[PDB]
Amino acid sequence: ECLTVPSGEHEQRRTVHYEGGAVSVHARSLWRLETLRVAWSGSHIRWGQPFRLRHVTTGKYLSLMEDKSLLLMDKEKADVKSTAFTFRSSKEKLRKEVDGMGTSEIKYGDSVCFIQHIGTGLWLTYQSSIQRKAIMHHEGHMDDGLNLSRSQHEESRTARVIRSTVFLFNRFIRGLDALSKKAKTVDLPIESVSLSLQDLIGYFHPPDEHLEHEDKQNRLRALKNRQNLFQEEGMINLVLECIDRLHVYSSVAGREAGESWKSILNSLYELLAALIRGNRKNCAQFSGSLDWLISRLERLEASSGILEVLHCVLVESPEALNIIKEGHIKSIISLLDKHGRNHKVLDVLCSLCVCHGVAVRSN
Amino acid sequence: GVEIETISPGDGRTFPKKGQTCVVHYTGMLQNGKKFDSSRDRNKPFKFRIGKQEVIKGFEEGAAQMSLGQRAKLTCTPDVAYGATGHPGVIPPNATLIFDVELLNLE
Amino acid sequence: SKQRKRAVVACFRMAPLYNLPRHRAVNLFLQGYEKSWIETEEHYFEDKLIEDLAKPRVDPLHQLILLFSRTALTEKCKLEEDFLYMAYADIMAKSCSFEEKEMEKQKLLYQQARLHDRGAAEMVLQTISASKGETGPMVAATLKLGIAILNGGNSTVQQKMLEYLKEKKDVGFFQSLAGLMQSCSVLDLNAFERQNKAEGLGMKVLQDDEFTCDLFRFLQLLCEGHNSDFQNYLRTQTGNNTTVNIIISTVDYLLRVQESISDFYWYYSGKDVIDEQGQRNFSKAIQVAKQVFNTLTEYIQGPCTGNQQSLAHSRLWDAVVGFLHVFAHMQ
Amino acid sequence: LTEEQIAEFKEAFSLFDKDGDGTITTKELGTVMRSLGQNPTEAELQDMINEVNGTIDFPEFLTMMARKMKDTDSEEEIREAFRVFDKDGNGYISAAELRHVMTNLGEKLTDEEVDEMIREADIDGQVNYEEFVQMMTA
Amino acid sequence: ILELTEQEELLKFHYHTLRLYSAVCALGNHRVAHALCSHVDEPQLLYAIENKYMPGLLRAGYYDLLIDIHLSSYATARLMMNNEFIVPMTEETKSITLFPDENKKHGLPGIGLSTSLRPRMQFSSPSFVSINNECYQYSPEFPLDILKAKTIQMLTEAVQEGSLHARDPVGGTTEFLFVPLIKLFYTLLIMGIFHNEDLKHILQLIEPSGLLQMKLPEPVKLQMCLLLQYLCDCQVRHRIEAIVAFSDDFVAKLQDNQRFRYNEVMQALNMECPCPEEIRDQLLDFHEDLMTHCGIELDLTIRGRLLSLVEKVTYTLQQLISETMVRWAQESVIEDPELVRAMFVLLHRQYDGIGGLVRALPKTYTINGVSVEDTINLLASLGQIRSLLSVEEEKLMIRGLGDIMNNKVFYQHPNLMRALGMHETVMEVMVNVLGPKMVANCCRFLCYFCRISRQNQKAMFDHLSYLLENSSVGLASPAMRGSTPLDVAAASVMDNNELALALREPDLEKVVRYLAGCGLPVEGERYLDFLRFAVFCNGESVEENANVVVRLLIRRPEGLLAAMEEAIKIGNAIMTFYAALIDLLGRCAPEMHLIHAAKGEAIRIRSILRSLIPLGDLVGVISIAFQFCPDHKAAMVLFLDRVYVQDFLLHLLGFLPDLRAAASLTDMALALNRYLCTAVLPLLAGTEHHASLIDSLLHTV
Structure with a gap:
């Protein structure tokens, strides 16, 4: 069983639950142990010295607000006695000033770490469908013995990339929401978006062909780990909505700095191709929104990106093919009759015709 | 409906009868200059029993006229053909046929 | 009983010898000839096969072993069946007076250098980690290949496996071994009684015991010869992220086998005439408990005192007390 | 069938x-x-x-x-499988030869089932198989 | 097309249109393959065979069109049946010789004896004429013999000029020369074309004992490895047809010998010794008899026949495979791992020939010469249901199953159905439907299938752990009796006591978790009806299911006895649910091992059965007897007689309305015969009930 924070778009992401099972491997079960000191912050974590926790995927801290509840709040709000915790091996209430990395106190695999708040002395314990909420309490149950498992390195890497990307794209979506209703001004990042976006296309880059089989499989495993975490944090939906709100005018914002709109749509469709191309899970979760792609398919300027995403979805999940129907296929044949002779349109029709091994005869 | 040119005549008087099976070699193509079927192609002479109402209507109307060796051209009206439905895959909706039928034998 | 009455009735009822129109007898001959005649000795061929393959460019047997390693290194979340693998692992396991006795020792050492030059250590040590917790026939053939190489307590193979596990630093392998021991068997409580009642009316218990006598034999042979580095590596597992202490896990399996032995004993404590089924089942559990005691000798044996301490704080002692309460009354 | x-x-x-x-x-x-x-x-x-x-x-x-x-198969076959033995044609099988003709193959069980025969079979000793029918066919 | 070797974008677009034409007609769409015989239009393909100047992409494209229009459907249909080996027992089958006439030589596997079943093909004609149901027919036709001679010619020319190592050949590289050509030659060899004067020519082109010993690229020798595995399969077919040819002459002499023995011991003059002769005479079935005869042959005059024929079934193509796959591994260090995996399968297979025969004997099966047409008809319907595994469709499935239902061979040969594995096929199609009338006919076929023999019910019992995972389909419906997957898991237990014992408590935990999901309906009684089949099975309730089911229900059975007495005036699902629950709780704790012995556990369980439904059940007994009315009272009889002297019995005396309705009816006409078996067990107001019984014996005058 583990700690968590609830999923996407429920709050604005402030409560605390538990859950066990398969939410441990996900992204939103991640907490970063900051300290008070700047200097020698990377000392060994000792029994009874203060610590904070930080939600690594949204960017908020575990600040016990004793007026109300056990919330999640920002850098500008959270202060020391509200959130400085301690770790013991017993549930009792009986150091601070060192330099060096100090005394190697707490293990990961062999540690029964009871979380004890400092200011109010409350204890992180659980209440009584498994969304078992944890509560701060003066006494506690017997089974508040939280054990510790560190993350890996690259999961911490993808985790911080998640909140960086979200904190940039909500700015970009709010910029489009401001500049789209009324005529402007309001600052809207473009070169930050273009640099970050070519970076994320580099980050989900497929492995090479010219590589040893062992390192290629390791690279492909790390790739699937990255795709799976951006699925379970909801990047596909976010990028999808940004592609909606960009695909209105055809080149309102500053038209010297709104001249990168073309390659930003090129990069967003290429990145949407990149968050799908391996996983059957992700294009299966994606398969609800397929008429969206096929409706934007005939927009004559981005049809390369829509078609590559559509092909990379239709190959690698037979669950997508049962949603697709006659109007969509007729639209793709009309795409063939608008835009000359592609061979990509016929690869789409070939993969739409047959699944993995199961053909589909009415289609 | 059917409008027949004589491409090569037969004798003109030995034209078929009900209860007979005619042995033809049809090589039928579209109005637009494109070929769709040919019984010259797989080298099987197509046979059909008149009166049992097997084939499309204009083909049976034209096989009533031709004689024992007459080659003709059965340009069929599109409502006498597959029709507003068309044949699903070969003949488009509301298409015209230009056959080429060389009647050979009777049974 | 009850249905045996109807069975004895049906024995007289089945009066036609061979009326059997013409071909039901042909069919039953066909099944009997399948069963009791085709299954013979063919198996001179294994060493002939491998001496036919280990001939020089990379050798054919290295092509084969490298094929199975590249299959095991991919990502599937569930291993295949691989009748190819299930055949060639059985072939490579079938293919392994004093001066004559060191000659036998030296040819066994050659027949294992025949494999573990070509990376047959690493394909075993991979195909165990790849099958996550699954106890299929795949893992059975991999363990029989891992035993058929270490069979004399070879030390090039043990050092080869330890250098492999310290390079490609697998938490998957020790995670996979603890996950294998998590099921493996019990003896029983009641499936034997149900098996006995079914046999009594209509006319297993250790379904896969021999998998456990492969697994703990494999864990014996990695430490036999007093590899204090490997005996310590099964405990502390230094470089990897999350260590799996395999020795308290094998203590837990010994405890589970103990309690199932004791609660087979309490079943037989009053009836006092042990049947043939009770003997054939009971010795079959005795071998597994004997085997896991032999492994716990081979972890401790060269006095690696950290392993004695880490085992002395385990639940060994409840299992030893329960074996004494079995022993006294059973003897 | x-x-x-x-x-x-x-x-x-x-x-x-x-x-x-x-x-x-x-x-x-x-x-x-x-x-x-x-x-x-x-x-x-x-x-x-x-x-x-x-x-x-x-x-x-x-x-x-x-x-x-x-x-009808039950009648004819319980007739003929005992027509195999008992060569004078009466249905009276002796108890020693009932021990012999009962330990057949197929079932081949121990003294439990033939003890079940001899404990109640009617023995005078010649045994008619109607008692075996009414016993063994419930 | 020949000009198009330099216009590369038009080349690549037409290569992908060929890929779409070959990918649309994927796995048996004949309604589409006739329209492609309009477009790509047969002798066009015969011209794209021949051109030594077409681009290699267009050459592989037109060979994949020639396969996937006209040949692929029947090639896959015969590759499905190549592992079944079923064979008649006619005199043509008995003339199979195993060995070419007293040599030491192999058959050279171009032998046309091949007396197995091997489903025949139909090529329909693609003419664009009459509505005649030929568009949905078997497949389009093609000139077979023309292309047979053409592929022979192209192979002879390509080998006799590619062994010269030109810098020419047809697709630039040698891959486009051989890969499509050996591919079409392979799917042409499978279909039983190439009669004996073409097989010998072909093998002389491969064996000489050539094509096999050249220097070849990877996919050429991958196709050749598949071809050569087919040659080993024809070796196996010859071997097994030969061994059935031997069995037809061994078994007649064995029958004659044992009935000769039956005569010589029937007239037992002296004596025991003849009593074990009657013992071996009268074993369990013919299976133990044949195992006994082969065992006594294993440790007369007939023993020389087996001891000689087994040495004739020692078995030089085997040696050339086992040499050349090694040579290809040695010389030419192999990428493309599918080739290595296909290589060592053959290297293993040519050594483990006894093992291949071990694998292939429990599929061969014999049929008398009458049933041959019906086995072809059943097996063509089964090829349809095999082919429909990888996809409007439900009508083909229904008509296939419904025609399988009506064959003499489906009952005369119940072992042939397990040998075909078609229960696993129909199960897998049913499962592939699930995440309609399709499933309601599939479950009906499976429940039909479990009742054709008792040992067949074992073969369906090895799937019950999965078959309960889908159980929640059976709900409020008319096609819920005899159509749910739950009903298949129920009808795979019904009669057997062995299969009653062999199931486990997690399966019963699946059923009781799905019954404790029903904390409200109609869905509860079907899980209860399965538990009723779990615990009881012959009249005598088996207790190692009864105890576990009672434990899992006494967690949460889920007042209540007056709540069945509530809802008479509301609907029938609640009443039937409480009757099924009281039947299920009524089918445990018998009285042999309760009164003849203080069993402990039996007493305890019986007390737990006391503790609920606490003998105030008599209102729900009596209030039925005047007014539903047939069966709920019968469920209360099976609770009260089993769980719970004649003073309590004389409290309960009535059935005067049923005795009075001899001339009224009409469900009362089926309750009257319902209680003529029910109140017979409570034999074990007296004048009034005697008068009512004598009046019923006036209704039974």
């Missing part, structure tokens, strides 16, 4: 079946049994009809006529 018997049952059914779905009508039971040569009382016929919507079909017709055949 044999080759010939199941062939005959399917031939009689499919000859009395017309529409091609595997269901004859309800009143065809006495007709198909008298085409097969069986004319029982009407109560057994009504039980067999109500054991089968109102469409008498293939499956349990096969099963019921299997039962009707295996009754």
Whole structure:
């Protein structure tokens, strides 16, 4: 069983639950142990010295607000006695000033770490469908013995990339929401978006062909780990909505700095191709929104990106093919009759015709 | 409906009868200059029993006229053909046929 | 009983010898000839096969072993069946007076250098980690290949496996071994009684015991010869992220086998005439408990005192007390 | 049920079946049994009809006529399997030879079942097999 | 097309239109393959065979069109049946010789004896004429013999000029020369074309004992490895047809010998010694008899026949495979791992020939010469249901199953159905439907299938752990009796006591978790009806299911006895649910091992059965007897007689309305015969009930 924070778009992401099972491997079960000191912050974590926790995927801290509840709040709000915790091996209430990395106190695999708040002395314990909420309490149950498992390195890497990307794209979506209703001004990042976006296309880059089989499989495993975490944090939906709100005018914002709109749509469709191309899970979760792609398919300027995403979805999940129907296929044949002779349109029709091994005869 | 040119005549008087099976070699193509079927192609002479109402209507109307060796051209009206439905895959909706039928034998 | 009455009735009822129109007898001959005649000795061929393959460019047997390693290194979340693998692992396991006795020792050492030059250590040590917790026939053939190489307590193979596990630093392998021991068997409580009642009316218990006598034999042979580095590596597992202490896990399996032995004993404590089924089942559990005691000798044996301490704080002692309460009354 | 018997049952059914779905009508039971040569009382016929919507079909017709055949098979085979032994033709088997003819193959169990025979078989000693029928066939 | 070797974008677009034409007609769409015989239009393909100047992409494209229009459907249909080996027992089958006439030589596997079943093909004609149901027919036709001679010619020319190592050949590289050509030659060899004067020519083109010993690229020798595995399969077919040819002459002499023995021991003059002769005479079935005869042959005059024929079934193509796959591994270090995996399968297979025969004997099966047409008809319907595994469709499935239902061979040969594995096929199609009338006919076929023999019900019992995972389909429906997957898991237990014992408590935990999901309906009684089949099975309730089911229900059975007494005036699902629950709780704790012995556990369980439904059940007994009314009272009889002297019995005396309705009816006409078996067990107000019984014996005058 583990700690968590609830999923996407429920709050604005402030409560605390538990859950066990398969939410441990996900992204939103991640907490970063900051300290008070700047200097020698990377000392060994000792029994009874203060610590904070930080939600690594949204960017908020575990600040016990004793007026109300056990919330999640920002850098500008959270202060020391509200959130400085301690770790013991017993549930009792009986150091601070060192330099060096100090005394190697707490293990990961062999540690029964009871979380004890400092200011109010409350204890992180659980209440009584498994969304078992944890509560701060003066006494506690017997089974508040939280054990510790560190993350890996690259999961911490993808985790911080998640909140960086979200904190940039909500700015970009709010910029489009401001500049789209009324005529402007309001600052809207473009070169930050273009640099970050070519970076994320580099980050989900497929492995090479010219590589040893062992390192290629390791690279492909790390790739699937990255795709799976951006699925379970909801990047596909976010990028999808940004592609909606960009695909209105055809080149309102500053038209010297709104001249990168073309390659930003090129990069967003290429990145949407990149968050799908391996996983059957992700294009299966994606398969609800397929008429969206096929409706934007005939927009004559981005049809390369829509078609590559559509092909990379239709190959690698037979669950997508049962949603697709006659109007969509007729639209793709009309795409063939608008835009000359592609061979990509016929690869789409070939993969739409047959699944993995199961053909589909009415289609 | 059917409008027949004589491409090569037969004798003109030995034209078929009900209860007979005619042995033809049809090589039928579209109005637009494109070929769709040919019984010259797989080298099987197509046979059909008149009166049992097997084939499309204009083909049976034209096989009533031709004689024992007459080659003709059965340009069929599109409502006498597959029709507003068309044949699903070969003949488009509301298409015209230009056959080429060389009647050979009777049974 | 009850249905045996109807069975004895049906024995007289089945009066036609061979009326059997013409071909039901042909069919039953066909099944009997399948069963009791085709299954013979063919198996001179294994060493002939491998001496036919280990001939020089990379050798054919290295092509084969490298094929199975590249299959095991991919990502599937569930291993295949691989009748190819299930055949060639059985072939490579079938293919392994004093001066004559060191000659036998030296040819066994050659027949294992025949494999573990070509990376047959690493394909075993991979195909165990790849099958996550699954106890299929795949893992059975991999363990029989891992035993058929270490069979004399070879030390090039043990050092080869330890250098492999310290390079490609697998938490998957020790995670996979603890996950294998998590099921493996019990003896029983009641499936034997149900098996006995079914046999009594209509006319297993250790379904896969021999998998456990492969697994703990494999864990014996990695430490036999007093590899204090490997005996310590099964405990502390230094470089990897999350260590799996395999020795308290094998203590837990010994405890589970103990309690199932004791609660087979309490079943037989009053009836006092042990049947043939009770003997054939009971010795079959005795071998597994004997085997896991032999492994716990081979972890401790060269006095690696950290392993004695880490085992002395385990639940060994409840299992030893329960074996004494079995022993006294059973003897 | 044999080759010939199941062939005959399917031939009689499919000859009395017309529409091609595997269901004859309800009143065809006495007709198909008298085409097969069986004319029982009407109560057994009504039980067999109500054991089968109102469409008498293939499956349990096969099963019921299997039962009707295996009754006569029970009689004839419990006759002939004891006609194998007891060479003077009376049904009186001695108890020692009952021990001999009971420990057959197939079952081959221990002194439990033949003790079950000898504890209650009627022994005077010659044993008639009607006591064995009424004992062993429940 | 020949000009198009330099216009590369038009080349690649037409290569992908060929890929779409070959990918649309994927796995048996004949309604589409006739329209492609309009477009790509047969002798066009015969011209794209021949051109030594077409681009290699267009050459592989037109060979994949020639396969996937006219040949692929029947090639896959015969590759499905190549592992079944079923064979008649006619005199043509008995003339199979195993060995070419007293040599030491192999058959050279172009032998046309091949007396197995091997489903015949139909090529329909693609003429664009009459509505005649030929568009949905078997497949389009093609000139077979023309292309047979053409592929022979192209192979002879390509080998006799590619062994010269030109810098020419047809697709630039040698891959486009051989890969499509050996591919079409392979799918032409499978279909039983190439009669004996073409097989010998072909093998002389491969064996000489050539094509096999050249220097070849990877996919050429991958196709050749598949071809050569087919040659080993024809070796196996010859071997097994030969061994059935031997069995037909061994078994007649064995029958004659044992009935000769039956005569010589029938007239036992002296004596024991003849009592074990009657013992071996009268074993369990013919299976133990044949195992006994082969065992006594294993440790007369007939023993020389087996001891000689087994040495004739020692078995030089085997040696050339086992040499050349090694040579290809040695010389030419192999990428493309499918080739290595296909290589060592053959290297293993040519050594483990006894093992291949071990694998292939429990599929061969014999049929008398009458049933041959019906086995072809059943097996063509089964090829349809095999082919429909990888996809409007439901009508083909229904008509296939419904025609399988009506064959003589489906009952005369119940072992052939397990040998075909078609229960696993129909199960897998049913499962592939699930995440309609399709499933309601598939479950009906499976429940039909479990009742054709008792040992067949074992073969369906090895799937019950999965078959309960889908159980929640059976709900409020008319096609819920005899159509749910739950009903298949129920009808795979019904009669057997062995299969009653062999199931486990997690399966019963699946059923009781799905019954404790029903804390409200109609869905509860079907899980209860399965538990009723779990615990009881012959009249005597088996207790190692009864105890576990009672434990899992006494967690939460889920007042209540007056709540069945509530809802008479509301609907029938609640009443039937409480009757099924009281039946299920009524089918445990018998009285042999309760009165003849203080069993402990039996007493305890019986007390737990006391503790609920606490003998105030008599209102729910009596209030039925005047007014539903047939069966709920019968469920209460099976609770009260089993769980719970004649003073309590004389409290309960009535059935005067049923005795009075002899001339009224019409469900009362089926309750009257319902209680003529029910109140017979409570034999073990007296004048009034005696008068009512004598009046019923006036209704039974």
